[PDB]
Design an enzyme around this catalytic site. Structure first.
Site, PDB file in Angstrom:
ATOM      1  CE1 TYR A  20      -2.968  -3.305   1.246  1.00 24.31           C
ATOM      2  CE2 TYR A  20      -4.083  -1.675  -0.005  1.00 24.31           C
ATOM      3  CZ  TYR A  20      -4.208  -2.823   0.418  1.00 24.31           C
ATOM      4  OH  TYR A  20      -4.933  -3.868   0.172  1.00 24.31           O
TER       5      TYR A  20
ATOM      6  N   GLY B 261       2.674   4.289  -1.229  1.00 30.42           N
ATOM      7  CA  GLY B 261       3.328   4.768  -2.539  1.00 30.42           C
ATOM      8  C   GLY B 261       2.498   4.463  -3.931  1.00 30.42           C
TER       9      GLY B 261
ATOM     10  N   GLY C 173      -0.391   1.891  -3.551  1.00 26.42           N
ATOM     11  CA  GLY C 173      -1.506   1.180  -3.188  1.00 26.42           C
ATOM     12  C   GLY C 173      -2.407   0.249  -3.885  1.00 26.42           C
TER      13      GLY C 173
ATOM     14  CG  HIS D  26      -1.704   8.191   3.839  1.00 27.18           C
ATOM     15  ND1 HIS D  26      -1.278   8.351   2.581  1.00 27.18           N
ATOM     16  CD2 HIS D  26      -1.732   9.342   4.256  1.00 27.18           C
ATOM     17  CE1 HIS D  26      -1.033   9.642   2.421  1.00 27.18           C
ATOM     18  NE2 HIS D  26      -1.485  10.328   3.465  1.00 27.18           N
ATOM     19  CG  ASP D  27      -3.232   3.872   0.131  1.00 24.97           C
ATOM     20  OD1 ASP D  27      -2.685   4.877   0.159  1.00 24.97           O
ATOM     21  OD2 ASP D  27      -2.694   2.882  -0.179  1.00 24.97           O
TER      22      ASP D  27
ATOM     23  CE1 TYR E   4      -3.817  12.111   1.661  1.00 30.60           C
ATOM     24  CE2 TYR E   4      -2.795  11.092  -0.163  1.00 30.60           C
ATOM     25  CZ  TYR E   4      -2.380  11.794   0.727  1.00 30.60           C
ATOM     26  OH  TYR E   4      -1.603  12.722   1.076  1.00 30.60           O
TER      27      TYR E   4
ATOM     28  CE1 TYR F 150       0.347  19.130   4.998  1.00 36.54           C
ATOM     29  CE2 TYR F 150      -0.854  17.984   3.283  1.00 36.54           C
ATOM     30  CZ  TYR F 150       0.376  17.944   4.269  1.00 36.54           C
ATOM     31  OH  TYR F 150       1.071  16.985   4.233  1.00 36.54           O
TER      32      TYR F 150
ATOM     33  CG  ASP G  55      -0.364  13.903   3.892  1.00 32.16           C
ATOM     34  OD1 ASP G  55      -1.113  13.017   3.618  1.00 32.16           O
ATOM     35  OD2 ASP G  55      -0.216  14.805   3.164  1.00 32.16           O
TER      36      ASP G  55
END
Ligand SMILES: Nc1ccc(C(=O)O)c(O)c1
Length: 121
Positions: free
Chosen positions: A27, A29, A31, A47-48, A51, A64, A89
């Site tokens: 997953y 870089g 996923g 994290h995937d 998002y 951000y 993040d």
């Protein structure tokens, strides 16, 4: 943005996002599929998913702002997308830090075909 995420990763872990987390496990870089290989890979899985919670945001490119209070990451107020991307993040960078103890170089450049099956977020 991806570049900011990478800077955050380096700050947190002392590893360069490329190559330490850009091609790790199933997953990180890039996923998609499979059972995450270890806790670090699960950071990327989540994290995937994080998002994925933001279909109308653009986390690769949208920038951000954040600051440090002590060592703690504090996401500063931008657009709603920016705020949500930053929180995703931040969580992943903290997660990488929390799991550095089990990070394994054998999962770098992990081949796709060893990543099979869908895992729901
Ligand atoms: N590597 C780890 C694993 C677990 C924890 C935890 O709080 O459960 C941690 O702080 C670091």
């Amino acid at each position: 943005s991806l570049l900011e995420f990478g800077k955050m990763i380096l700050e947190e872990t002392g590893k360069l996002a490329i190559p330490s987390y850009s091609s790790y496990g199933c997953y990180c870089g890039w996923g998609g599929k499979g059972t995450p290989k270890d806790a670090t890979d699960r950071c990327c899985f989540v994290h995937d998913c994080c998002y994925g919670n933001l279909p109308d945001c653009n986390p690769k490119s949208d920038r951000y702002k954040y600051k440090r209070v002590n060592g703690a990451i504090v996401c500063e107020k931008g657009t709603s997308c920016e705020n949500r991307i930053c929180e995703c993040d931040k969580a992943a960078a903290i997660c990488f830090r929390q799991n550095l103890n089990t990070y394994s170089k054998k999962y770098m450049l992990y081949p796709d075909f060893l990543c099979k099956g869908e895992l729901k977020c």
